[PDB]
Amino acid sequence: VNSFSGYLKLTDNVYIKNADIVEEAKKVKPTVVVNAANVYLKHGGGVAGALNKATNNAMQVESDDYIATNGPLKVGGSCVLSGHNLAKHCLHVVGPNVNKGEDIQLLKSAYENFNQHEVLLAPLLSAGIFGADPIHSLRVCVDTVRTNVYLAVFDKNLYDKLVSSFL
Numbered sequence: 388v389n390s391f392s393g394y395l396k397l398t399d400n401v402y403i404k405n406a407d408i409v410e411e412a413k414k415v416k417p418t419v420v421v422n423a424a425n426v427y428l429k430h431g432g433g434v435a436g437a438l439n440k441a442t443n444n445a446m447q448v449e450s451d452d453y454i455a456t457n458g459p460l461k462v463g464g465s466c467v468l469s470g471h472n473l474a475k476h477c478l479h480v481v482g483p484n485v486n487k488g489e490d491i492q493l494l495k496s497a498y499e500n501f502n503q504h505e506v507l508l509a510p511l512l513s514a515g516i517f518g519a520d521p522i523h524s525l526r527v528c529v530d531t532v533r534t535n536v537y538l539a540v541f542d543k544n545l546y547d548k549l550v551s552s553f554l
């Protein structure tokens with residue numbers, strides 16, 4: 388039993404809800420919140436810009452130190468950093484950005500990072516400003532993640548489409 392509330396169950400381990408991941412994080416304080424990161428951990432917009440704003444820019448400060456030490460992530464890769472006031476940890480995961488021309492096949496590799504964590508709160512990778520089809524992102528998620536994932540979809544209209552079109 389966990390603290391997540393109001394989710395629709397899609398499969399044995401994948402759950403979905405119309406919610407702002409920022410507000411959802413502040414309430415549950417999950418062990419892991421997933422960020423829709425880019426390879427530079429520049430959290431300017433989308434989920435990343437919103438999550439960072441909620442940490443009063445502490446996420447960005449920590450991220451800049453991480454990049455200065457380690458260099459950029461790989462597309463499809465991840466790193467674990469602090470969750471600040473939102474969660475114990477933040478798993479920064481880089482899905483392919485279609486608006487940059489990146490291989491959508493890397494979306495599966497991106498979701499594989501979730502399997503290193505027993506329970507996560509997450510957005511649909513490569514959705515939103517990353518330019519991929521959210522219906523596809525959901526399909527890859529369900530077919531790749533085996534741990535317990537609680538997916539937050541900001542747009543109510545998109546959520547209903549995701550639910551109503553789910554196979």
Ligand SMILES: O=C(O)C[C@H](NC(=O)c1nc(Cl)nc2[nH]ccc12)c1ccccc1
Binds near residue numbers: 437511541
């Ligand atoms: O779920 C969605 O719609 C897509 C998702 N967007 C959000 O998570 C989101 N949208 C709005 Cl508008 N306000 C927000 N506040 C806190 C979060 C948040 C997303 C994910 C990755 C890249 C780009 C977009």
